[PDB]
UniProtKB/TrEMBL annotation:
Gene name per UniProt: cntA
Domain Clostridium neurotoxin receptor-binding C-terminal: 198-384
Family according to the record: Belongs to the peptidase M27 family.
Species annotation: Clostridium botulinum
Domain named Clostridium neurotoxin receptor binding N-terminal: residues: 1-189
Compartments, record wording: Host cytoplasm, Host cytosol; Host cytoplasmic vesicle, Host secretory vesicle, Host synaptic vesicle membrane; Host synapse, Host presynaptic cell membrane; Secreted
Name of the protein in its database record: Bontoxilysin-A
Amino acid sequence: LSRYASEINIGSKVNFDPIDKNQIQLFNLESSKIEIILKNAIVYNSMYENFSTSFWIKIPKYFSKINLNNEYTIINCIENNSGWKVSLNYGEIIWTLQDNKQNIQRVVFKYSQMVAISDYINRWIFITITNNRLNNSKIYINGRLIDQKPISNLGNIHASNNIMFKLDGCRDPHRYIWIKYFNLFDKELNEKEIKDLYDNQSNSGILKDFWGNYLQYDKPYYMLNLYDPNKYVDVNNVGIRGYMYLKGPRGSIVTTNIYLNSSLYMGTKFIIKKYAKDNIVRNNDRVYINVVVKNKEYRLATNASQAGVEKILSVLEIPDVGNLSQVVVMKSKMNLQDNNGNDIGFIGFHQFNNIDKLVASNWYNRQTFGCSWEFIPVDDGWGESPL
Ligand SMILES: CC(=O)N[C@H]1[C@H]([C@H](O)[C@H](O)CO)O[C@@](O[C@@H]2[C@@H](O)[C@H](O)O[C@H](CO)[C@@H]2O)(C(=O)O)C[C@@H]1O
């Protein structure tokens, strides 16, 4: 789907996401490419006309020293040494402009791999790049302005007729990217236009996992509580006599001079089960939550007749749930309901004798709280090994 091109050439080694066919995976392989041939009107050739581009990208973590000092192109629109391109490097997204007089200007976005929880590593991020031929070129990340450089000294920019989506110059043989929702604009977008594009293309009716992919059923997720991200979920004991609690701190995954992050595959995984025709978790879906303890699934539930508004959650055997409250209404996070269809509360945590146990409390519904979760599945772009 491209309203900019008359011909779309797809190499034999382009992979498409089966759950979300909008997502395109381009490998560091020579047939892993998509060339689009712009319509004659969309082709850029001017000294004064402003233009802007936007796209979503998910960049896997850089794992080794073979990734340092290796700027490689991913989106190429340069012909006869003139035009624009998007390139990548170790912890960098790079925008480059070239005129017909060997003038070059680069605008760069930088993110670190030496952070506990990154917002960019192996996660979908919205990139917007805007260009005002009378002053500056700007790069936005998730709608926030990051950096800007002057381009007014650049003469005529005759871009290419084609746009080549392909990893070019990359020395990492395992390297790939995910890309979707490429767009071109014949104006300099302002912050509000970028803000609206970011929200419009977010698919707010579908829940997303930690990496930005669609939330799915029968997919094991490691849980992260956004109020205190240094904790992970554990199960004291299975049965109505045990509870779920948040214990910390998280571990570390390290590779010297490359990355130092918190480990994400920690704690008892959650598995979302269907209750009330695909494997996509949408807003207001009523689902079941299964929790694995020692490689065995059990049903998350509680006894809402317990004292206090904070209803401590237990992990019971599925055949032995009885009439205990278990239905969860997913929301884009988890609103546990009783069998009467009434809210018991958003799933969060509450301190009980120095133990931050997971509770379902309507105090959240009344009122970032302890009910803010992220679902972290195993992903090749992260690289960690599940313990
Ligand atoms: C005590 C503390 O430092 N933090 C609280 C936190 C804050 O009250 C608030 O979210 C700051 O923005 O809120 C959390 O705790 C809640 C309790 O304060 C409340 O009485 O009961 C809640 C459960 O029904 C919940 O435990 C939270 O938002 O989860 C965490 C912490 O206690």
